[PDB]
Every structure is written in C-alpha cells, then in structure tokens.
Amino acid sequence: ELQPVIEANLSLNQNQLASNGGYISSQLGIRNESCETVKFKYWLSIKGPEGIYFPAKAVVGVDTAQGRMLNVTRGFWVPEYMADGKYTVSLQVVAENGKVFKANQEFVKGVDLNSLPELNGLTIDIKNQFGINSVESTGGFVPFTVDLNNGREGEANVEFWMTAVGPDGLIIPVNAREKWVIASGDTYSKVRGINFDKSYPAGEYTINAQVVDIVSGERVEQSMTVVKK
Amino acid sequence: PVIEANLSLNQNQLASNGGYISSQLGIRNESCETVKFKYWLSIKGPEGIYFPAKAVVGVDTAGRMLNVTRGFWVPEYMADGKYTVSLQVVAENGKVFKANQEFVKGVDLNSLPELNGLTIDIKNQFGINSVESTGGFVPFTVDLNNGREGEANVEFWMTAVGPDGLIIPVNAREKWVIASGDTYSKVRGINFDKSYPAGEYTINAQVVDIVSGERVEQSMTVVKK
Numbered sequence: 001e002l003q004p005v006i007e008a009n010l011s012l013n014q015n016q017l018a019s020n021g022g023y024i025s026s027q028l029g030i031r032n033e034s035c036e037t038v039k040f041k042y043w044l045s046i047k048g049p050e051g052i053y054f055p056a057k058a059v060v061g062v063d064t065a066q067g068r069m070l071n072v073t074r075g076f077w078v079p080e081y082m083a084d085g086k087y088t089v090s091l092q093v094v095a096e097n098g099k100v101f102k103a104n105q106e107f108v109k110g111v112d113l114n115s116l117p118e119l120n121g122l123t124i125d126i127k128n129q130f131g132i133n134s135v136e137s138t139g140g141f142v143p144f145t146v147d148l149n150n151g152r153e154g155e156a157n158v159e160f161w162m163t164a165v166g167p168d169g170l171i172i173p174v175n176a177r178e179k180w181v182i183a184s185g186d187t188y189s190k191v192r193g194i195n196f197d198k199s200y201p202a203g204e205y206t207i208n209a210q211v212v213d214i215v216s217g218e219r220v221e222q223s224m225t226v227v228k229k
Numbered sequence: 230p231v232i233e234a235n236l237s238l239n240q241n242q243l244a245s246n247g248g249y250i251s252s253q254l255g256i257r258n259e260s261c262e263t264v265k266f267k268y269w270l271s272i273k274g275p276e277g278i279y280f281p282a283k284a285v286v287g288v289d290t291a292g293r294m295l296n297v298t299r300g301f302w303v304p305e306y307m308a309d310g311k312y313t314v315s316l317q318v319v320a321e322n323g324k325v326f327k328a329n330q331e332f333v334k335g336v337d338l339n340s341l342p343e344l345n346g347l348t349i350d351i352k353n354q355f356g357i358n359s360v361e362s363t364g365g366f367v368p369f370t371v372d373l374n375n376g377r378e379g380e381a382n383v384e385f386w387m388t389a390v391g392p393d394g395l396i397i398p399v400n401a402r403e404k405w406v407i408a409s410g411d412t413y414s415k416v417r418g419i420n421f422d423k424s425y426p427a428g429e430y431t432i433n434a435q436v437v438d439i440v441s442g443e444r445v446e447q448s449m450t451v452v453k454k
Contacts, residue, residue, distance in 0.1 A: 041422060045388060045396035051277030051446065053388045053433055055398030059420075079384070081442035092395060098424050100393045159304075163271060163279045167392055168325045169429045169450070170317055171271035173281030197267065199323050203428065204394045208279055217306035221277060225394070 003033040006040060010091040010103035019110035021078040026056070028091050029103075030070040039063045039096040044074055049085035049221065056089070084110025086117075117220045119213045121152035122182070126209045126222040134227040135196050142226055143193035144174075144207065150182040157181050157214040164194055164226075167203035174207060179214070196228050203228060231260040234268075234328040236316040245335035247305040252282075252330075254299055254316050258292030265289045265321040270299055275310035275446065282314070309335030311342075342445045344438045346377035347407070351434045351447040359452040360421050367451055368418035369399075369432065375407040382406055382439045389419055389451075392428035399432060404439065427453050 013025040032038050044057035056076040064070065078087070086108055093101040116123040125147040132142045150156045162174035174194045182188050194207065207224045235255035240248065258264045270283035282301040303312075311333055318326040333340075341348040350372040357367045375381045387399035399419045407413050419432065430451045437444040 041424070043398050045398060047396060049277065051275070052435070052444075053390055053396050054386050054435065055388050055396075055401055058398050058401055079437075079439075081437055081439070081444070090394070090396060092397075094395070094422070094424050094426075096424050098426060100395065100426065102394060161280050163281055165279055167428050169315070169327060170319070170325065171273060171279050171281075171315060172317075173269050173271060173284045176281055176284055197319075199267070199319050199321055201319075201323060201325065203392050203426075210278070210280065212306055214304075214306065219278075219306075 001033065001035065005032065005034045005038050005095055005099065006093055006101045007031045007033060008091050008093050008101045008103040010089065010105050012089060012105045012107060015105070015107040016113045017078055017107065017109040019084055020080040021082060021109060023075055023077050024089075024107060025073060025075045026089060028070075028072040028074060030093060032064045032067050034067070037063070037065055037067070040093050042091065042093040044089065044091050046076075046087055046089050048087045049083040052083060078109060082109065086111075117222060119156070119158070119211065119218050119220055120216070121150070122156045122158070122213070123149045123151065124211050124220055124222060125149070128207070128224050128226070129191065133225065134229055137198070137202060137229045139196055139198040141193055141195045142207075143191055144209070144224070145189070145191050146209070147187055147189045148180070148182060148211065149187040150184055153184050155181055155183050159212045159214055160210070162192065162207065162209045164205045164207050166205040167201040170201070175209075196226070200228060231258065231264050231324060232266065232318055232320055232326045233257040233259060234316050234318050234326045236314065236328040236330050238314060238330045238332055241332050242338050243303055243332065243334040245305065245309055247303045247307065247334065249300060249302050250314075250332060251298065251300040252314060254295070254297040256295040256318060258290045258294065260292060263290045263292045266318050268316065268318040270314070270316055272312055272314050274312045275308040278308060303334060307334065311336070342447055344381070344383070344436065344443050344445055345441070346375070347381045347383070347438070348374045348376060349436050349445060349447060350374065351449070353449050353451070354416065357451070359454055362423070362427060362454045364421055364423040366418055366420045367432070368416055369449070371415045371417060371434070373405070373407060373413040373436065375409055375411055378409055380406060380408045384437045384439055385435070387417060387432065387434045389430045389432050391430040392426040395426070421451070421453050425453060
C-alpha cells in the first residue's frame with residue numbers, strides 16, 4: 001500500500017533492575033506492510049556502560065513471505081556482575097536491499113530510571129541541546145549543553161572531555177580534556193558544539209562525553225547519537 | 230596517493246601510575262595536486278574509553294609535508310590495559326587516512342589479556358582484514374588457558390559492532406567451566422552478508438569471570454568494502 005518495506009518495534013516488560021540484575025522479557029514486532037514481500041535478517045543486541053556489548057538473539061534470515069507479520073518474545077538475563085548504569089536494547093533489521101531498521105528501548109541497572117548520571121553527589125547533565133538527531137550530507141552543526149552540579153559538601157575535582165566516535169574508525173575531538181574545580185553547591189555550565197563538515201563520512205556518530213573524578217578515579221559517560229545523512 | 234600519514238610514540242609501556250607519551254605526526258602530500266584536509270589525534274582505550282589529544286585542524290598544502298610533535302599525559306586513574314593512539318586525516322574529497330600506534334598501561338606490552346591466571350587468546354584465524362562488498366566470512370580462534378590452581382567459571386560472547394549502529398551477534402553468551410591446567414578452545418566465524426553496510430566492523434569478544442565479576446575484552450577489526 002505504498003508504505004515502508006519494514007516497520008520494527010520493541011517493548012520491554014520492565015526497565016529498571018536493582019544492582020543484582022534480573023530478567024527482561026522483550027516483545028519483537030516486525031511487519032512488512034509494503035506492496036511487495038521482502039527478505040531480511042534480524043537480531044537483538046544490547047549496548048551497555050564501559051564498552052559493554054552483548055547479544056540477546058542470534059542472526060535469523062526471514063523471507064516474508066511464503067506482506068506478513070512477525071511477533072517474537074525473547075527474554076534475557078542481566079547478571080549482577082554487569083556494570084550498573086544505562087543500557088540500550090536494540091532490535092535490528094537489515095533488508096536484502098541494504099536498508100537498516102532499528103527499534104530501541106532503554107533500561108537501567110542499579111540506578112534510578114530518570115536520574116542524572118553522577119559521581120557521588122556530583123550530577124552530570126549532558127544533552128543534545130536542541131534534540132537534533134541528524135544532519136544533511138552537505139554538513140550541519142550540533143550544540144551540546146553540559147551542566148555539572150556539585151551536591152557534595154566538599155569541592156569536586158573532575159576531568160572532562162568529548163569525542164565523536166564515527167564511521168571508518170574516526171574518533172573526532174569535540175572537547176579537549178579540561179580540569180575543573182567545582183565548589184560545593186556550585187554548577188559548572190558550558191555549551192560545546194561539533195561541526196560535521198561535509199567531507200565527513202555518512203553514517204552514525206556517537207557523541208561521547210566522559211567525566212572523571214580525579215580523586216576517586218570514578219568515571220562516568222554520556223552517549224548521544226547524531227546521524228550524518 | 231593523495232595523503233600519507235605516519236605516527237610514532239616515544240614510549241610503549243606505562244606503569245599503572247601513568248606517564249607521559251610524546252608522539253611524532255607526519256602528513257605527506259605526494260600527489261600531483263595540492264590537497265585540503267582536516268586532521269586530529271585521538272586515543273581509544275579499555276572499558277569504552279575514548280579521549281582526544283589534538284583538536285580538529287583545517288590544512289591546505291598551499292604539495293608538501295607536515296610535521297608535528299604532540300605529547301599527552303595519561304593519568305593514573307585511566308584504566309590499566311591496552312590503548313590505541315590514532316592520527317586521523319579526512320581530505321576535502323571525503324577520503325580517510327589513519328596511522329595507529331599501540332601502548333599499554335599497567336600490563337606487559339606483549340601479554341595476552343587475562344583474568345588473574347586465565348589467559349584469553351582470541352585471533353582472526355587467517356588474518357583476513359577485509360571482505361568484498363558482495364560478502365565474505367571470517368573465522369576467529371578462541372583459546373582460554375587456565376593457569377590457575379583452581380577451576381575457572383566464565384561467561385563468553387562476541388558481537389560485531391559496525392556501521393549504522395549495528396551490533397551483530399557473533400557468538401551467543403555461553404558459560405564454561407575450565408579445570409586448572411586446561412585450555413578451552415573453539416572456532417567461531419561471522420558471515421558478512423552482502424546486504425550489510427560497507428564500513429568498519431569491530432569484532433568484539435568479552436569474557437567475564439562469573440566468580441570475581443571481572444571482565445576483559447578483545448577487539449579485532451574487519452572492513453567491509
């Protein structure tokens with residue numbers, strides 16, 4: 001009916017685990033509503049803190065069919081030893097013609113679902129300022145806000161930096177490593193952008209910010225996706 | 230070509246308390262035409278670490294050669310393990326050039342990754358660094374040698390982290406019991422279907438000691454043309 005070849009969707013039965021982990025049941029929906037049938041491969045994977053990536057469901061090839069609808073329930077355990085923090089579950093589909101379709105859902109382990117990432121009282125609030133998820137192939141610019149609020153009774157000493165982790169193994173500097181001293185009660189604020197020059201390769205860029213407490217050595221990250229068309 | 234990139238480090242091995250590394254950057258334009266590009270210096274480390282060492286700079290050979298010295302501190306609090314320093318260049322026409330050097334922190338330079346006596350030896354079996362755009366298959370060897378006195382209990386898995394945010398399962402999570410003195414060995418490959426997008430895939434193996442909770446990683450690159 002002149003529609004997209006594939007529509008993927010994903011829901012999780014639950015999305016906040018305690019520190020000792022637990023089980024999450026995923027519902028996977030893949031529909032082929034377009035006029036013609038389609039072949040694709042799909043799978044389910046998870047991205048986590050500290051460079052964690054793990055599979056939840058193996059690659060399966062589908063000829064749909066002989067339109068058609070696909071509904072799968074797939075559960076997975078998240079063991080206690082996996083790092084506490086934010087996780088993304090991603091149902092991923094690649095069509096025969098190379099088109100990629102993804103449906104993502106987030107869950108958290110050991111932290112509150114809506115709480116800011118933090119280093120023991122120092123909260124780290126880093127955002128895509130205007131919610132700009134992609135830029136034209138001819139180039140675009142995306143600003144990020146950075147607000148660190150020190151809720152400790154003592155001053156905080158952190159090191160901060162940002163990169164854009166992209167196609168072709170590119171790791172583009174976004175913010176050089178800086179050291180900040182943040183008095184108790186104060187908030188360190190800045191805005192920092194990245195120009196995606198037209199020459200940069202098309203694909204997905206992970207804008208990655210990292211903050212380290214220089215005293216404790218504790219490190220926390222905030223990742224944000226921008227696609228260059 | 231149009232661009233040649235070269236990178237060297239004055240030091241390869243850091244103790245856990247960190248240290249300072251000086252790098253020599255070389256970018257050469259042998260091409261018959263002058264060339265316009267941007268370059269920078271970045272580091273990939275363990276546990277999701279990425280950090281910059283030299284900001285984006287626009288350059289127009291107006292060809293000729295560029296030589297730069299660039300040092301950087303690696304403080305004590307950065308995770309021990311294996312780091313990759315990468316001089317990267319993107320020319321005006323979108324062509325990408327990279328020169329890489331490895332360094333280590335708190336571990337021997339030529340040491341297998343390990344979990345306290347249990348060594349993890351994971352390799353691209355036949356040294357196949359790329360596959361055609363019409364598709365190819367790459368097998369990997371997996372050898373876990375338990376040097377400990379007691380048995381080891383681990384969970385193991387692999388994915389391929391690729392373009393377009395793809396995270397393709399390569400080996401499902403499985404749990405192994407490895408007696409003292411024994412080696413667990415397998416071979417596991419990944420098919421890069423024709424339909425998968427062109428670009429860089431990181432084949433990523435992770436192994437967790439179920440008892441200690443300690444996790445270690447081995448990454449290997451395959452490029453789909």
